């Protein structure tokens, strides 16, 4: 993990160019790899926090530049990029600040019932024509191999509680996995670019229009299963829910959603032995005790 002050963030974007005058900076946000920075009210410049962040940050310039103005919805559009070094693809990166604010729940559910419709249909079209993008000229290891991080998840959560847990506890981590791995449903798909953090969060709206203005955060975008793009929208707390992504999916022509539902049920346990890497990373209770919890609930077989 590395950090920044405001001093450092300027001197970098300074230092590569000169001419661009820095009158505002301030923090934005800051997720799992960046921390975001706006700057004069109309530029978002990400710097990475570590070095997979840094190539998440390559990876999200170079498909920015490779589907502009290619979508139905817009998109941030590169105007400021850094440089190499060591570790690290990309110091930094500047995006065009695109106007709205994050489409939540909440706000979906007071939005008037044609509205609602709407940004069914408008996400539906936009990941269409996003896994409609011809995928031969890139390069492999953008492919995501599930198989891959079923394995490294598997292996950080065992070190992770190699103090916390007894053998016949750990052996149901193993266990998880092994059952996940040995169905073809969750490997057997046509692969294709997705977003693959397609989430309330990251999409835009217009609270004069009532539409979505802006779909952003491409740092995780892949070639993968399409499918995952629905299903990050479906959990009922935090994003959109069944009866909104229903909508989408039949907008969207999906002709298999039964194994779309499948694929969530299977995410929903997922996400629970995920978060607890990041639980205690970040050190969340909630995240670490629920997985926790979830692990000794299990009986295998």
């Known amino acids: 993990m590395r950090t920044y002050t405001f ?16 009158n505002t900076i301030e923090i934005s946000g800051e997720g799992n790899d960046c921390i975001a920075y706006e700057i004069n009210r109309d530029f978002i410049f990400k710097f990475p926090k570590h070095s997979r962040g840094s190539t998440n940050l390559f990876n999200e310039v170079n498909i920015l530049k490779r589907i502009h103005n290619k979508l139905p919805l817009p ?48 996400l539906a079209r936009f990941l269409s024509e996003l896994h409609s993008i011809n995928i031969s000229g890139f ?26 847990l007894k053998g016949p506890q750990m052996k149901k981590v193993d266990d ?8 073809e449903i969750y490997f057997k798909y046509y692969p294709c670019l997705i977003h693959n953090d397609f ?12 539409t979505i203005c802006g779909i952003i955060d491409f ?9 995952n793009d629905f299903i990050s929208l479906m959990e009922d707390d935090e994003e959109y829910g069944m009866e909104f992504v229903s909508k989408i999916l039949n ?20 996400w629970s032995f995920e978060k607890i890497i990041y639980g205690k ?21």
Request: charged share 30%; hydrophobic share 30%; net charge negative.
């Open 7 to 22: 001093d450092q963030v300027e001197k970098a974007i300074e230092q590569l160019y000169p001419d661009f005058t820095i």
């Open 75 to 122: 998109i941030p559009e590169v105007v400021f990029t850094g440089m190499p070094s060591e570790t690290y693809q990309m110091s930094f990166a500047g995006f065009t600040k695109i106007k709205g604010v994050p489409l939540t729940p909440l706000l979906l559910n007071n939005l008037p019932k044609q509205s609602q419709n709407q940004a069914a249909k408008d």
């Open 139 to 164: 390069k492999s290891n953008l492919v995501l191999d599930f198989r891959e991080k079923i394995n490294e998840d598997n292996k950080k959560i065992k070190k992770l509680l190699s103090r916390e």
């Open 281 to 301: 990373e970040y050190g969340y209770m909630d995240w670490y005790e629920e997985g926790l919890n979830e692990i000794r609930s299990i009986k295998i077989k």
């Open 176 to 183: 998880f996995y092994r059952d996940i791995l040995e169905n």
């Open 199 to 210: 989430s309330s969060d990251h999409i835009l709206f217009d609270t004069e229009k009532n």
């Open 219 to 227: 740092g995780d975008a892949a070639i993968s299963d399409p499918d």
């Open 251 to 270: 907008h969207y022509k999906h002709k298999d959603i039964p194994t779309v539902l499948e694929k969530y049920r299977m995410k929903e346990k997922y």
